[PDB]
Every structure is written in structure tokens, then in C-alpha cells.
Amino acid sequence: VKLFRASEPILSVLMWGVNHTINELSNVPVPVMLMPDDFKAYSKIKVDNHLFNKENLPSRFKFKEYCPMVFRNLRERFGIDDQDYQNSVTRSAPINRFLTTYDRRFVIKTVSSEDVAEMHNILKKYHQFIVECHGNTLLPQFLGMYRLTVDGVETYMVVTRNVLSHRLTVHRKYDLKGSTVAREASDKEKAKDLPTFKDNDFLNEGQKLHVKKNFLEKLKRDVEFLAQLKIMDYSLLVGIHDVDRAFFGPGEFDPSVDVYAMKSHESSPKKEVYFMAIIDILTPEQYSKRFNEFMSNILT
Amino acid sequence: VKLFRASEPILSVLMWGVNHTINELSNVPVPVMLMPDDFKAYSKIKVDNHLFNKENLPSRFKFKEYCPMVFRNLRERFGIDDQDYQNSVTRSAPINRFLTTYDRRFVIKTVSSEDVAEMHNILKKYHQFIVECHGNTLLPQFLGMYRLTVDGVETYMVVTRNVLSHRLTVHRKYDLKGSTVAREASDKEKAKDLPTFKDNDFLNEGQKLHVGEESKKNFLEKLKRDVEFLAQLKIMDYSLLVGIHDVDRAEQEEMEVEERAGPGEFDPSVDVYAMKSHESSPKKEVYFMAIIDILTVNPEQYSKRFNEFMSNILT
Numbered sequence: 001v002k003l004f005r006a007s008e009p010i011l012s013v014l015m016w017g018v019n020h021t022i023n024e025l026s027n028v029p030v031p032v033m034l035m036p037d038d039f040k041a042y043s044k045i046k047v048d049n050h051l052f053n054k055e056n057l058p059s060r061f062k063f064k065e066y067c068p069m070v071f072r073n074l075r076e077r078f079g080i081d082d083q084d085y086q087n088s089v090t091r092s093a094p095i096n097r098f099l100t101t102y103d104r105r106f107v108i109k110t111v112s113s114e115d116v117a118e119m120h121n122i123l124k125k126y127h128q129f130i131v132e133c134h135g136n137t138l139l140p141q142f143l144g145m146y147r148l149t150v151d152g153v154e155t156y157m158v159v160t161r162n163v164l165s166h167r168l169t170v171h172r173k174y175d176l177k178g179s180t181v182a183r184e185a186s187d188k189e190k191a192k193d194l195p196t197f198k199d200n201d202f203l204n205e206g207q208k209l210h211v212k213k214n215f216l217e218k219l220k221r222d223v224e225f226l227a228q229l230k231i232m233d234y235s236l237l238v239g240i241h242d243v244d245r246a247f248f249g250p251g252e253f254d255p256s257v258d259v260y261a262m263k264s265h266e267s268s269p270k271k272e273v274y275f276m277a278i279i280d281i282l283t284p285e286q287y288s289k290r291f292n293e294f295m296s297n298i299l300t
Numbered sequence: 301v302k303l304f305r306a307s308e309p310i311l312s313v314l315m316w317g318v319n320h321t322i323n324e325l326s327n328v329p330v331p332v333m334l335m336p337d338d339f340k341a342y343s344k345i346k347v348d349n350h351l352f353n354k355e356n357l358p359s360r361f362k363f364k365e366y367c368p369m370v371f372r373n374l375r376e377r378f379g380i381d382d383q384d385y386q387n388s389v390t391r392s393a394p395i396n397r398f399l400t401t402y403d404r405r406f407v408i409k410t411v412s413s414e415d416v417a418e419m420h421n422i423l424k425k426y427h428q429f430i431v432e433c434h435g436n437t438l439l440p441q442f443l444g445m446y447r448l449t450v451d452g453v454e455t456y457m458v459v460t461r462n463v464l465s466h467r468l469t470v471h472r473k474y475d476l477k478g479s480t481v482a483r484e485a486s487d488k489e490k491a492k493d494l495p496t497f498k499d500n501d502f503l504n505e506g507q508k509l510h511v512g513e514e515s516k517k518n519f520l521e522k523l524k525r526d527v528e529f530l531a532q533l534k535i536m537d538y539s540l541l542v543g544i545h546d547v548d549r550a551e552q553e554e555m556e557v558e559e560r561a562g563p564g565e566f567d568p569s570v571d572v573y574a575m576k577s578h579e580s581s582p583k584k585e586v587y588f589m590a591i592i593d594i595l596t597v598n599p600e601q602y603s604k605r606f607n608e609f610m611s612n613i614l615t
């Protein structure tokens with residue numbers, strides 16, 4: 001019984017809508033492939049109850065899903081079953097603009113109208129690039145994109161698969177950009193429960209990441225693709241888990257789930273698990289090489 | 301997997317709507333009591349898809365369900381599972397303004413906005429009546445009420461359980477109102493396949509129904525209670541619907557079907573208006589009898605003439 005009980009009502013609508021749209025899709029056959037119109041399609045639902053079912057939902061709200069068929073296909077190509085996606089969103093309210101599902105499997109990012117337009121401009125090429133990868137890629141894995149309307153105000157959301165592990169506590173996080181600029185953790189951010197250490201502090205800390213080659217074979221392909229689409233401003237996200245810090249076990253992960261995880265070599269000083277993926281690709285060619293250059297020199 | 305294919309877009313929308321509201325309702329807990337708000341409540345849904353899922357449904361439609369908690373309670377009080385109700389509407393398109401679900405269990409009547417308003421003004425007394433008679437009534441058993449919007453046009457629909465069996469063929473039917481006036485079926489009507497006969501057609505045929513004492517008296521007690529209730533609401537124009545099933549004729553027809561390649565027994569949990577004919581009766585028959593057309597000569601007077609007529613309708 002899905003009472004859509006959430007820490008605030010926009011999350012109740014998120015849960016209701018993902019539930020609703022995924023059930024509707026279970027009544028829509030999967031095609032022999034996608035058509036152009038699938039890349040221009042949307043679904044729209046306006047809910048207007050009166051004295052009914054108001055305990056957790058609002059009485060009036062809207063939900064819009066951009067390109068349901070394309071995103072259902074992507075979900076398939078990334079190895080995610082729709083009912084799993086549905087349960088990760090609906091079984092308990094998402095948690096903390098960036099959210100995660102209760103099981104930390106997927107992350108929900110608030111985006112702008114500009115970003116939604118940008119994904120529409122990239123979508124057919126993104127999808128064919130993922131067809132040609134057989135999904136073996138470091139780009140964000142886009143699972144769904146929604147517009148919610150609560151109390152008159154529209155909110156746009158993109159759902160991705162999580163870079164970090166949904167089970168293993170992550171001990172240090174870095175947001176690398178490869179720039180010839182000055183990205184460093186702010187003193188306010190440096191005092192966070194878990195800091196986000198941008199580019200400079202990765203070399204001012206001295207962390208290396210020890211292991212090998214298939215990774216760069218995939219990354220070069222990715223950033224070539226992003227530059228060739230005039231995308232800039234993207235970051236690479238690195239997460240460090242210290243096994244030693246510490247049923248189930250330490251350093252133990254499922255690679256079918258934590259798709260980006262990577263075990264450290266025996267030669268590493270500490271026993272570690274790394275997680276690595278590209279993020280924030282909704283906005284040029286120089287940016288590619290510089291960026292690649294930086295990460296060219298993270299691995300040992 | 302449910303395509304909702306139907307001969308008309310409105311039926312498709314009806315199937316979608318019953319599916320949607322029943323599944324929504326399954327996420328809503330079943331209340332201890334009903335509250336008064338529940339009798340003014342409604343659920344609205346407005347769909348505008350674009351290049352998406354338009355094989356069977358329209359891109360744009362609306363669906364409204366009246367007092368859904370109240371009709372869910374009613375369903376439960378008439379022994380009808382919600383899951384079953386949605387399957388009868390959604391597994392296959394309803395058929396032939398009157399429709400029936402494919403499995404012939406439920407009847408869907410297009411009605412008027414005034415009918416919806418009348419249902420609203422009587423619903424709370426109707427629900428109390430059903431509660432205090434435990435669903436034992438010849439009145440209509442109302443299961444849902446909806447408003448569909450297709451091509452900018454609203455259509456009101458009331459779902460009821462069938463007076464007629466979902467299995468046993470009906471070979472005669474009468475619509476009796478007890479009126480003093482000459483109710484008779486037209487040449488047009490009397491030329492249909494299953495013509496719907498009226499009062500004087502019933503009398504000129506000298507039809508009488510032998511049900512036996514026990515179920516006769518159950519029927520007459522039910523009917524006294526029901527039409528007293530109706531009269532206390534200023535409701536008229538309602539009829540008794542009687543369908544007659546000829547067991548022997550059904551045996552012959554079914555055998556003629558089998559040749560092209562129990563008997564007279566029914567389930568009273570399902571065919572709740574069904575009565576066997578007395579052990580010592582001329583033909584082995586099964587009747588189905590109920591009150592119909594409830595949303596609208598004094599009302600006390602209509603009650604009186606009606607009851608005195610239907611009292612003599614059977615032996």
C-alpha cells in the first residue's frame with residue numbers, strides 16, 4: 001500500500017508520478033525500436049481531487065514525463081528493471097538541490113528549463129551513443145526526466161544512476177575539472193560532514209588511485225563525444241572508500257549495482273574502493289583535452 | 301498488459317478510468333466509518349499526452365469519479381471485490397445508452413447531469429438503507445458513477461450490477477410500472493429479438509410466475525421495504541424488471557450449439573435477483589426480478605399502485 005508519505009509534498013508528487021507513469025508504461029508494448037516522434041513525445045497528467053486522498057498527496061498537482069519511451073529504453077539498456085526503478089522511488093520518500101532514493105540507488109537532481117531543453121537537443125545522439133557502447137560508459141546514465149507542478153510552481157527533475165555506491169560509506173569525495181583555474185574547497189564546504197574537494201586539493205592532498213586501461217579507453221570515447229556535441233562545464237566525480245575504516249562485508253560490493261566501482265591494486269598503501277564517473281553534461285573542444293589531460297595523470 | 305482496445309474512444313477511456321481509479325483506490329486505506337466529506341468528494345484526472353500512447357486512447361481526455369470512497373464501500377457491501385470489478389471492466393471492451401461488461405456481470409448506463417445530481421442528493425440515505433438491510437434489496441446496486449470527457453464532451457455513467465444472470469440466457473423480459481395507464485410495447489419493440497414488454501403485454505399474455513412460498517414472501521418483504529424507501533424520497537418512474545429463463549429451451553439451444561461441431565441452476569451470490577420456480581410448476585423456469593430507473597400521481601401513490609401490481613405478478 002503506497003501511501004506517498006514524504007518529507008515535503010513535492011516529493012509526494014515525485015513518488016506518485018513515478019509510480020503512475022511506470023504503471024502506465026507497463027501497459028505500453030516495447031517497440032521494435034524508437035521512432036523520431038518518441039524523442040519529441042511527452043506525457044501529461046493533471047490531478048484535481050476534492051475531499052479525497054489528501055492525507056499525503058496534494059489535491060491539485062501536475063506531472064509531465066519527457067520522452068517516456070526513450071527513457072524506458074535507456075532504463076533497459078542500462079540494466080535497470082522498471083519495477084526496480086519504481087520501487088526505489090516509491091517505497092519510501094527520497095532523502096537529501098540533490099536527492100537520493102531511500103536505498104541510495106538513484107539520484108534526483110533539480111534542473112532548469114534550459115537544462116531540459118539541452119537534453120532534448122542531445123537526446124537522439126546520446127541514445128545512439130549508448131546503443132553503440134552497449135551501455136559501457138562513464139557518462140551519466142539518464143533514467144527519467146520529469147516536470148512537476150505543485151502550488152503553481154514548476155520543478156524540473158532528472159533522475160540518474162548514482163556514481164557512488166548505494167551501500168558502502170564513502171570516505172572522501174572530489175569534483176575534478178581539469179582546469180587551468182582555481183577550484184578549491186571553500187572554507188565553509190571544507191567544514192562539511194563530508195567535503196567536496198575540487199581540483200586543486202586533489203594534488204595538494206597528494207592522493208593517487210592505484211590500479212587500469214579499459215577505463216581510459218572508455219573515458220576518451222566519452223569526452224570526445226561530449227566535445228563533439230559542444231558540451232562544456234562537465235566534472236568528473238571521484239569517491240574513496242577506506243575498507244580498513246569499516247550479513248555483509250568490508251570492501252564487498254556488487255558490480256552489477258555499483259557499476260562505477262573499482263577495487264584498488266595490492267600495491268595501494270591503504271585498502272580502498274574507488275568510484276568514478278562524469279557528471280553535469282547539460283550546457284568546448286579545448287575543454288575536452290585539458291579535462292582529459294588532468295585525469296590522464298590520476299591512475300597508477 | 302492492457303491495451304484498452306474498444307470500438308469507440310469513449311469506451312477505451314472508460315476502461316482506462318475504471319482501471320486508474322481502482323488502482324488508485326488500492327493505495328487508499330479502507331476507513332473505519334465514512335465521513336460526510338466523502339459524500340461531496342470527487343476525483344478528477346486530466347490527460348494530455350503528445351506523440352505517446354495514442355494507439356487506443358485519445359491523446360487528450362478527462363475522467364471524474366464521484367464519491368469514490370462511498371461507492372467502494374458499496375461495492376464491498378454488495379459482495380463485489382474491487383479487483384473483480386476492474387477486471388470485468390478492463391479485460392475486454394464492454395458491449396451493447398446501455399452497455400454491459402464483456403462477462404455480462406455489470407451494466408453501464410449513460411445518464412444525465414440531473415441524474416448525477418439526484419444520485420448525489422439521495423446517496424447518504426441510500427447508503428444507510430443498504431447498511432441497515434445488509435444489501436438485501438431489489439433496488440439498483442450502485443457500484444460507480446463517472447464523468448468522461450472525450451473531444452470536449454462530457455458523458456455521465458452509472459455502473460450497476462446486472463438484474464439478469466451473467467450465464468443463463470433470458471428468453472422473455474417485462475418492464476412493469478404498475479401504472480393505471482396503458483403501457484404496451486410498440487410494434488417496433490415487439491419486432492426486436494428480445495423485445496422488452498410492458499405491463500399490458502404482461503397481462504394480455506396471462507403470465508404468472510410460480511416461485512413457491514418461501515421466496516415469494518422474501519420477495520414481497522424486500523419489495524415493501526424498497527418501495528417505501530423510494531416513496532419517502534419523492535422518486536418515481538421506476539420499473540420492475542422481470543426476465544424469464546426457460547431451462548428446457550436453454551438445454552435445447554445449448555445442445556444445438558454443441559451439435560454444430562447444473563441445468564437451470566444458478567449461484568445466488570452472483571445472480572442475486574434469481575429465483576427458481578416452485579417444485580410443482582408447469583415449466584422449469586428461472587426468474588430475475590429487480591427495481592430499476594431510480595433517479596428522478598403522488599410518490600406515495602406510485603408506491604401504492606406499483607406494489608399492488610407486482611404483488612399479483614406472481615404466485
Ligand SMILES: O=c1[nH]cnc2c1ncn2[C@@H]1O[C@H](COP(=O)(O)OP(=O)(O)O)[C@@H](O)[C@H]1O
Nearest residue numbers: 098107160161162163164175196235237279280
Ligand atoms: O550521482 C551523484 N551521487 C552522489 N553525489 C552526486 C552525484 N552527482 C552529483 N553529486 C554531488 O552534487 C554535486 C553537483 O554536481 P554537478 O556538477 O552536476 O552540479 P553543478 O551544475 O552545480 O556544477 C557534485 O559535485 C557532488 O557534490
Ligand SMILES: O=c1[nH]cnc2c1ncn2[C@@H]1O[C@H](COP(=O)(O)OP(=O)(O)O)[C@@H](O)[C@H]1O
Nearest residue numbers: 398407461462463464475496539541592593594
Ligand atoms: O440491469 C439490467 N439488465 C439488463 N437490462 C437492463 C438492466 N437495466 C435496464 N435494462 C434495460 O433498460 C431498459 C430501461 O431501463 P431504465 O427504466 O432504467 O431507463 P430509462 O430512464 O430509459 O426508462 C430496461 O427496461 C431494460 O430494457
